[PDB]
Design an enzyme around this catalytic site. Structure first.
Site, mmCIF file in Angstrom:
data_model
loop_
_atom_site.group_PDB
_atom_site.id
_atom_site.type_symbol
_atom_site.label_atom_id
_atom_site.label_comp_id
_atom_site.label_asym_id
_atom_site.label_seq_id
_atom_site.Cartn_x
_atom_site.Cartn_y
_atom_site.Cartn_z
ATOM 1 N N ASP A 35 0.825 -1.190 0.000
ATOM 2 C CA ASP A 35 0.000 0.000 0.000
ATOM 3 C C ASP A 35 0.866 1.248 0.000
ATOM 4 O O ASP A 35 1.385 1.627 1.042
ATOM 5 C CB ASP A 35 -0.921 -0.017 1.227
ATOM 6 C CG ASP A 35 -1.790 1.216 1.329
ATOM 7 O OD1 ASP A 35 -1.863 1.991 0.354
ATOM 8 O OD2 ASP A 35 -2.411 1.406 2.399
ATOM 9 N N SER A 199 -0.444 15.772 -11.777
ATOM 10 C CA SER A 199 -0.711 15.418 -13.158
ATOM 11 C C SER A 199 -0.926 16.675 -13.973
ATOM 12 O O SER A 199 -1.482 17.655 -13.487
ATOM 13 C CB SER A 199 -1.937 14.503 -13.254
ATOM 14 O OG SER A 199 -2.269 14.262 -14.607
#
Ligand code: 47Q
Length: 330
Positions: A35, A199
Site C-alpha cells: 500500500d 498530473s
C-alpha cells in the site's frame, strides 16, 4: 541488493493486490496488500481476536525465533474506506522477493474491522508511503522500504500492476524490459507523507487533452481513480446512461456500455487507461448497473491515483534524497 515479487489480484475485479511476504524464522508466508498510501506493516496474527479472523493466514510471533516484542509499542490505523485495525508490535525478519530486512517492525493486529475479517485473501498490509505516517506509538517505526533503502542497489521500488492478471513489485532496480518507451519522472511532495504529485491534465477517449494541474497521490492501496468532480463528470458524460447515484455511492453505468479510455498527463507524457479498466462490474450480483472505476474525489479531500490508473503504467517510486515518481507506458 534487490527484491522481486509477484503481486496478484485478490478477485476478478482487481479490487486489491496481494504479495507474498516472508516473516520470521522459520519463514511464515503471509499475503500482504502493498500500500503506497500508508506506512504500517501489519498482519493478522495469533493475537487477533478469534471472532475477527475468518480464513486469513496469521503470523504467530511465538513460533519465530527472531521475533522480539517491541516493548510498550502499540499501533492503530484507519483507512479511507473506513476500515481499521490496531494492536501491538514485534520486530522480526521480513523478506520480500528475496530482499531481506532484519528488525522490521511487524505490527500484530489485536483488532481488525469487519471489512478485513470479511476478506479472507488479505493477511495484512505492507505500507510503502513515507515513514512519517507510521502509526506506531510512542516510537514511530520505519517502513520496509525505508529499512531496506541503504542496502538496495538503487533507492527505488517499482509497481507493475496487472489488469486482471499478476504483476510485479521490484525493489532496488528498474526492469527496463517491463515498460515501453521512456520513464517520465515528476516531482513529489512528501509534506502529507504520501507519494503526492501533480498530473498535467487529462483526456477522455479520443478527445483533446485538457491541460490542467491535478494534485494527487499514487496509491496502490486504493482500487479506483478519484479525481475532481469536473473531470469525472466530463468522463461519464461520454457514456450513455451513466449517472452519479447517491444510493450506490458513485457513478454507475449500463453494463452494456463500451467505456471510453481515460488519459492522464505525466509532464509532457501521457498514460492511457483503457476503457475496460474502468469497469468494476455489476453493483450487485445479477444487476445490469455497473460501477465506474473513475469516481469523484469531492469530500475525500485529495485526488487518488489508485490501481485503475497505476495498473495502466510502470511506476517508479524513487526514494532518493529528493523523492520523485516515474511513469512509463507498458
Ligand atoms: O479503495 C479500496 N481499496 C480496497 C481494497 C480491498 C477492498 N475489498 C476487500 C477489503 C476491504 C477492506 C479490508 C480488506 N479487504 C476494497 C477496497 N477499496
Amino acid at each position: 541488493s534487490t527484491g522481486s515479487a509477484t503481486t496478484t489480484p485478490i478477485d476478478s475485479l482487481d479490487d486489491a493486490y496481494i504479495t507474498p511476504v516472508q516473516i520470521g524464522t522459520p519463514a511464515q508466508t503471509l499475503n500482504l496488500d502493498f500500500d503506497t498510501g500508508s506506512s504500517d506493516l501489519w498482519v493478522f496474527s495469533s493475537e487477533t481476536t478469534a471472532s475477527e479472523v475468518d480464513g486469513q493466514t496469521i503470523y504467530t510471533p511465538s513460533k519465530s525465533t527472531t521475533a522480539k516484542l517491541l516493548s510498550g509499542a502499540t499501533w492503530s490505523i484507519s483507512y479511507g474506506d473506513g476500515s481499521s485495525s490496531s494492536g501491538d508490535v514485534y520486530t522480526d525478519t521480513v523478506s520480500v522477493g528475496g530482499l531481506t530486512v532484519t528488525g522490521q517492525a511487524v505490527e500484530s493486529a489485536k483488532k481488525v474491522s469487519s471489512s478485513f475479517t470479511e476478506d479472507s485473501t488479505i493477511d495484512g498490509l505492507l505500507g510503502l508511503a513515507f515513514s512519517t505516517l507510521n502509526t506506531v506509538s510512542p516510537t514511530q517505526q520505519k517502513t520496509f522500504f525505508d529499512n531496506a533503502k541503504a542496502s538496495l542497489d538503487s533507492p527505488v521500488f517499482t509497481a507493475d500492476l496487472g489488469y486482471h492478471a499478476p504483476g510485479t513489485y521490484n525493489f532496488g532496480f528498474i526492469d527496463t524490459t517491463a515498460y515501453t518507451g521512456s520513464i517520465t519522472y515528476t516531482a513529489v511532495s512528501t509534506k502529507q507523507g504520501f507519494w503526492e504529485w501533480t498530473s498535467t491534465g487529462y483526456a477522455v477517449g479520443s478527445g483533446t487533452f485538457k491541460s490542467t494541474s491535478i494534485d494527487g497521490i499514487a496509491d496502490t492501496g486504493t482500487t479506483l481513480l478519484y479525481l475532481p468532480a469536473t473531470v469525472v463528470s466530463a468522463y461519464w458524460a461520454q457514456v450513455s446512461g451513466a449517472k452519479s447515484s447517491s444510493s450506490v455511492g458513485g457513478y454507475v453505468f449500463p453494463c452494456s456500455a463500451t467505456l471510453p479510455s481515460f488519459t492522464f498527463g505525466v509532464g509532457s507524457a501521457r498514460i492511457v487507461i483503457p476503457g475496460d479498466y474502468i469497469d468494476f462490474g455489476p453493483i450487485s450480483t445479477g444487476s445490469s448497473s455497473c460501477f465506474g472505476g473513475i469516481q469523484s474525489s469531492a469530500g475525500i479531500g485529495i485526488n487518488i491515483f489508485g490501481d485503475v490508473a497505476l495498473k495502466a503504467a510502470f511506476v517508479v517510486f524513487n526514494g532518493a534524497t529528493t523523492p520523485t515518481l516515474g511513469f512509463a507506458s507498458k
